[PDB]
Design a protein around this ligand. Sequence first.
Ligand SMILES: Cc1ncc(C[n+]2csc(CCOP(=O)(O)OP(=O)(O)O)c2C)c(N)n1
Ligand SMILES: Cc1ncc(C[n+]2csc(CCOP(=O)(O)OP(=O)(O)O)c2C)c(N)n1
Ligand code: SF4
Ligand code: SF4
Ligand code: SF4
Ligand SMILES: [Mg+2]
Ligand SMILES: [Mg+2]
Lengths: 501, 1163, 167
Amino acid sequence: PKQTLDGNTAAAHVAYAMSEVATIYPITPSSPMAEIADEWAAHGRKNIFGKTLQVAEMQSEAGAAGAVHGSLAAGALTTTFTASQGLLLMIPNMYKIAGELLPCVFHVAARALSTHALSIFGDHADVMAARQTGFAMLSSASVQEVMDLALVAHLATLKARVPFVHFFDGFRTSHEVQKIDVIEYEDMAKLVDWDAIRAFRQRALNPEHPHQRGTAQNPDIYFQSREAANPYYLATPGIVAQVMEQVAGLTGRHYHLFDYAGAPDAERVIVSMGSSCEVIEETVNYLVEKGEKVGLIKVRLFRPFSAEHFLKVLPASVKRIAVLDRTKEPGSLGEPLYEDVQTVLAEHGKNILVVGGRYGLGSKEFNPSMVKAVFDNLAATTPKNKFTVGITDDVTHTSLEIKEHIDTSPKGTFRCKFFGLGSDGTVGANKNSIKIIGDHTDMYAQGYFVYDSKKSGGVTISHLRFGKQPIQSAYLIDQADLIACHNPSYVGRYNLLEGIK
Amino acid sequence: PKQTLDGNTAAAHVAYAMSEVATIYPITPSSPMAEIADEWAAHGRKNIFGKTLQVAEMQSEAGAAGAVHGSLAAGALTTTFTASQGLLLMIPNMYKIAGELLPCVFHVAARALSTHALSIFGDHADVMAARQTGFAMLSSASVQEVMDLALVAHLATLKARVPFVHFFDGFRTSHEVQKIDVIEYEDMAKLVDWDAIRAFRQRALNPEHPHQRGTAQNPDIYFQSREAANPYYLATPGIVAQVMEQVAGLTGRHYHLFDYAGAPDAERVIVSMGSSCEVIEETVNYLVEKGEKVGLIKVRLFRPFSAEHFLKVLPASVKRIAVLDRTKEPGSLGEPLYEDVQTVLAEHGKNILVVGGRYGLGSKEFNPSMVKAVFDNLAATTPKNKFTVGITDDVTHTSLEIKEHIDTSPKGTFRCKFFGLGSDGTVGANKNSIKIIGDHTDMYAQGYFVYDSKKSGGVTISHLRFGKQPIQSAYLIDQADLIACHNPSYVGRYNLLEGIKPGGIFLLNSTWSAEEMDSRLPADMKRTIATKKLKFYNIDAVKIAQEIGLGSRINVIMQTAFFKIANVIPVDEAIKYIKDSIVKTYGKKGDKILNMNFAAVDRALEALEEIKYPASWADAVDEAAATVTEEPEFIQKVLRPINALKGDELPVSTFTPDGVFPVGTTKYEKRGIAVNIPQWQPENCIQCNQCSLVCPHAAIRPYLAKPADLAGAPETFVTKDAIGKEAAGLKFRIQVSPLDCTGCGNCADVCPAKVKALTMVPLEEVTAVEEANYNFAEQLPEVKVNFNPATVKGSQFRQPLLEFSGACAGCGETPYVKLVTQLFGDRMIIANATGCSSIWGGSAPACPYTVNRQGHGPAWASSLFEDNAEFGYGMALAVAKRQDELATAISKALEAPVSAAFKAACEGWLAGKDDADRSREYGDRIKALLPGEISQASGEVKDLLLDIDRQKDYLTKKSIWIIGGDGWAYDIGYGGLDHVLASGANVNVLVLDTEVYSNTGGQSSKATQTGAVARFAAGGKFTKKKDLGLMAMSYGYVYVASVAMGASHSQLMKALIEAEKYDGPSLIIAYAPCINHGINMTYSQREAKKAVEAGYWPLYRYNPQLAQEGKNPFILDYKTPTASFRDFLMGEIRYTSLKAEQLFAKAEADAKARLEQYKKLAE
Amino acid sequence: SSIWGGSAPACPYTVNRQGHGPAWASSLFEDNAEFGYGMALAVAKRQDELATAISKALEAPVSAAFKAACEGWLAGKDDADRSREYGDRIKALLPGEISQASGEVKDLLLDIDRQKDYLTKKSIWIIGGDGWAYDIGYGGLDHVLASGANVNVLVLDTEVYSNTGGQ
Ligand SMILES: Cc1ncc(C[n+]2csc(CCOP(=O)(O)OP(=O)(O)O)c2C)c(N)n1
Ligand SMILES: Cc1ncc(C[n+]2csc(CCOP(=O)(O)OP(=O)(O)O)c2C)c(N)n1
Ligand code: SF4
Ligand code: SF4
Ligand code: SF4
Ligand SMILES: [Mg+2]
Ligand SMILES: [Mg+2]
């Protein structure tokens, strides 16, 4: 059926169905996943095993991670929800869970790490800090993809024995409300490898068929023992690809380890990950229709990085590539996705100019005008490398100049902004309006809400979209058809009518 | 000056001079840094600020990292030392320390991360997991570079405001002893940027010029604020380069961000990091001299990666590059350094074929032959990418072929190997020999020491090198000029003479004469001695030590024999240096002990005998090997080759992909290391089985048998009539396992008979007899007996499911765990924290946990040091879920057309699934009816029965046991332990309280008492012992008990059964005597008796069930002590070394206040 | 307490007329006790560096009134009231004492003036909620209390996770 959900609920919907245990510890913006899963169990929702999910809160995410390890090693399918500093505390146990080849899915609302300052907002800094744990990493770019790819990760991890991090952009996707196609629990159970679940049960710690795990090893066998898991990692791309085809036959939506969008003869291509892919594809449609030879490669399966599947969707006409990383590794030669793209192209002798940049740190806005600036830099005689987009770097001069303002929203999309007062009911009403419009029309409906740190009396700005076409606008509203001001004090204080058509 | 140090001491030397505060938490192999820094402070060593360094131990590396952050923000220069899992826990604060641009140096002895298995050994996995924190990363390749680059990091971080990780290869460099140039503290202070220090003080948190840091930021400014630190990272390469110029002018040793070595016109170049650079450069010199155009780029500054400094040292003729990473990122396109090199070369349009490989994981050997294999792969038509070196990967075929063996050791380098026994003095003497040679000659000196997993009686192999040229050989010795065997038992057991050069020296310690050599030495050893024309020397060092009065200590004797034949220095000079070291080691022992060691030197010179062997030894032929017994595949293919020191030859296809091991494999070891074993006196035995209870290795057990079963018994298998109404008509015998006994002597001390029924006799005299006795007792059939398991005697007739572990002789920990398996081992799951209990409980490839005749036994798992409570908590959730799935299928069977007896057993199980006895009774009934019930069913009903059979291993209720040491329970895992106890889950926590960190050598813990001396508490611990039991009692619904087996057997039995039957969280704090206490391990049980009698250790039981019955939950099991508290402290070295009087008085006052408080809770 | 206490760009902690007021820092959720513990060690180190320079001033040709305030401060550096009393006396005598000095004595007085912000004994306050003290940071809080350090821990017990909505 069609329902209006946010990313967190879409992920919890699938995680609840596919798991028996959930050991959790709350952290924004991932805790709504654990909260709504706790409510469903209290209301008696059954998973595909006919029972309610058991939610156990620990003293920290470190305690949660250790509990996952013990629950998995003893024979219970276990999931968890975390982000940012919480994901960091789980990293030590992630090495164990991957090392022991235990099926598992971590659902992460990717959030910035505390550096010069704390930030509750979204980027991939937390996920990138765990890219060496041996977990597989699957990125979903929209609420619909959170629904679909959460199922992919849960199905794939059972087959591959490699645990998965399924991550989606914090707030920008985790709190974005969208009308999506919801996959029935009965249909999930029809795709599960039940043989793989039973084999997982046979390996469990049990005194009636005992074993020892987690030994300490000398230099004589440790290296060999670490390489003994290579076949499982070599097989994980093909397993994910086949699981994606199962979902394709069920839903009609075709995912690949790497997806391509844009001109078949594109010469400038952006490689990106997460919700930025939505913004870029919307911009690419606008530019391709204008005659520009541009394209986009969406990274779904970040780890294991399959060179075969990346090159499979890279058009032969590509001469210049801009890679966008939603993270910062200070002092590094480049950010992770940029170094992956640079490496794979060198390993295959491709003469392609590759350039890397950073964007969207701490939920920094990333809109189509920034996407064109990235494309414009690829068209320059000397493209700027190691750049930034969305800020003005007047110290080290890394930022790209936003030359012109473009409006790439598909025509026929209604756009509304609502300026509200803290806890005056505006956000709640707009959510109900999205549900009303989504449930009773054929239109896609989208909602995103800008909050303040103050619990009472802050400014809230709701961004709502409705259209006959899928809404890929993972950015704030540019040209509003309707603007509502629910507080007379704002008149003369804020630029309410800014950008109204 | 020149001193012989290891990497850890070299690093601590600079860190101590440059720092005011050091907040630490111990972890191998980085903890020696914090230990020696604590010792220097204890003796008043001054840093460059004229003060002693303040060393503070935290509860974990997370607590250490937070303390570093706070100390830095408040204006103190602060350092720390860590590695591996410790570095992981510091990563969250590393983001903050870098984000706030605080000068700092983390010194890391790089160690592998715990994945499919724990590994204390060296690779870059830990450092690579932090490469995105914003710390700078500086790599040291040798002990000399640890000294130099530690200074570079401390100097550069003040100027750059970017904190540094200065890391060096764990063990391979941190524990490698080398003679190096040591930088004077006064010279360090002349290079320090004192303006940069003062500016750091001005930025400090201070109420007279306050500021705010660590704010929370919205999306509007967070990105810009994060990029504002770019100038500091852009400037760090130039700053590090300039500091390297300061150190160069002071020392003459020139470092660069990237250094090049090899042919100026090289076409094949290796890019690498750490001690591998030493091995590669030595190989490059050898190959370049032979005409090959090869080179090497050493990565010093890994972060920030400066493209300008990398390309400047890359020769223009390079066509092919192999990048070597000492880490593995599974599923990654490539490892980190390979991706950096590939990226930078692409950014500058270099047409260079780049290939990446992995090496040296977990201290895997990386020698010149492997280096050439990497160079040969660059010379192939199609170089293999994503390769491995040092292993045979027959599954995924990533390993490079080691074609030929090369010797790249510089000519004139002397090479020696010493095969020693655990704690026989060999390693200590070799360290002293390196100090002697380094201090008194112009030669470079190098030492590396290979240790064993066995704590007592293990094999040690020392690797020593001396030469006129710098020693870059960061690998084991291949061709030895001299080989010494300090244990004659190794003759015929290990390949001692492997790779010895023709005409080399073989020194042997044995009582065998030249004529007995023909019969005692194996044929292969005689062949090597003759063909290579070795100088064979022998010495009866034990005879010398006996006659002088030194007992069996041969360390001084064997060291004297080495210098006598090695021809490394003048023999007369060596004798003086040895006696000078004897004065330094035995000067405080007394005048009598001194002259005995002087006599050891003198007599050792005259007793060394050259063995004139016949030339016909070269033609000797191996004797026909006996018909070997058919052993299981794992024992034959895995365990034997590993114990034969051949585990490196095992290919990848040998191992499971997830680190899963079988149980019950220690019974194949049969080490036979005991000097004395208990001999049973049948006439004095009262059949009490207390000897079986206290044995730390389950080497002595009682055996019952019907008289018919004693048919094929040897004549020496003397038995006695069985005492007790349960064993009427049976025979009784106390039998010892001679090859598994350790000779500790606890069983003879516990034997309560009038005349001792167990007497210690030498093993060799009775070994042939008792082996036949044990082999018959072990094959005896099972005897159904109705002895009460709640008694000491009745529990010991149950089979021990923990046997023959690697714990020390007389260990105070294993008897507790052994007893738990005898009570509930049939149905228990163990979550074991890192520590001693995980080392003797789970060191590959042998598992001391075993199964009974039905194949049932404890399932064992170890996760981390910090997560053990939550680890077992997760197990409890899963087991409950699996029992729920089983219960659902059984309830469906009630609606199915099945036999009435099946429904009767199903209803009985459903009503008692949560009771241990009832779930087994009705569970076993269902198992007996299942094969016949399935045969009589068909269709969907047959499937319903097949689903019950699929889950029949959850009918019996399980017993979750969370086992760990006091360091886990009181410190790093206390927060998790507190939460699991508060949760109310039905888990049983067993804390083996040794009051120290026993595994890592004896560091301080919160369980350490007042006045006790341990590492990080050199002057004695001032604060009293934290009362873990008292805090757990505050919840009220937690079963808490304090036990001590040596003090009261019945109190231990009572608390264990009460804790396990309690439907809730249970905490057992067990007093575990340890070798670190400084006591005679023969009387380990007796020391626990004096502990309770002196008020040092309490015995109580807190039962929440008594509160619901209207009774007092707290029961004080020992109210009035009869022994002196001050006298118990005098019986352990850990308290006598303080003599100081103020701490003894404080310890007694705390014991009286704790005892009086327990009287208040009971009254 | 960190959201209303330290959300950029506004800081609610302020200074008095002399410009003195609480210095505020937030590290992580789990490390706050050990965080403040490290601050306590550092401040003690900074007072020791100042106290060493003041003892050298007793051995220097400086005014008798300057030596009297130094002896009073050295005797009361660990008391809040006494360290402020003699500390402010040193601050009042420093500009005139530096004016009458030269050479190494002038450098020694300038070194006192460089560290005069540690004359008054500091008061370390470790502030956090019940979620920090009872759960994620309890192990660190337990250790810092057991250490015996002179720190002041303030647990704002709301009996819930107030910031994150009430968990
Ligand atoms: C996070 C982490 N820090 C440090 C270590 C190193 N380490 C393992 S066990 C141990 C001490 C064990 O002490 P205890 O818990 O008392 O067990 P015991 O050896 O005394 O029986 C240490 C320091 C580690 N494995 N992980
Ligand atoms: C490692 C980590 N885990 C979780 C979080 C999310 N988080 C921050 S504060 C907080 C709860 C605050 O509770 P409390 O300590 O009682 O303070 P209060 O807001 O109620 O005053 C949580 C769950 C985090 N920032 N870091
Ligand atoms: S001497 Fe020690 S190891 Fe040997 S049987 Fe007796 S208690 Fe066991
Ligand atoms: S302790 Fe002595 S009396 Fe008791 S069973 Fe053992 S040998 Fe017999
Ligand atoms: S606890 Fe002590 S006696 Fe037991 S194995 Fe460890 S070091 Fe040896
Ligand atoms: Mg201990
Ligand atoms: Mg609170």
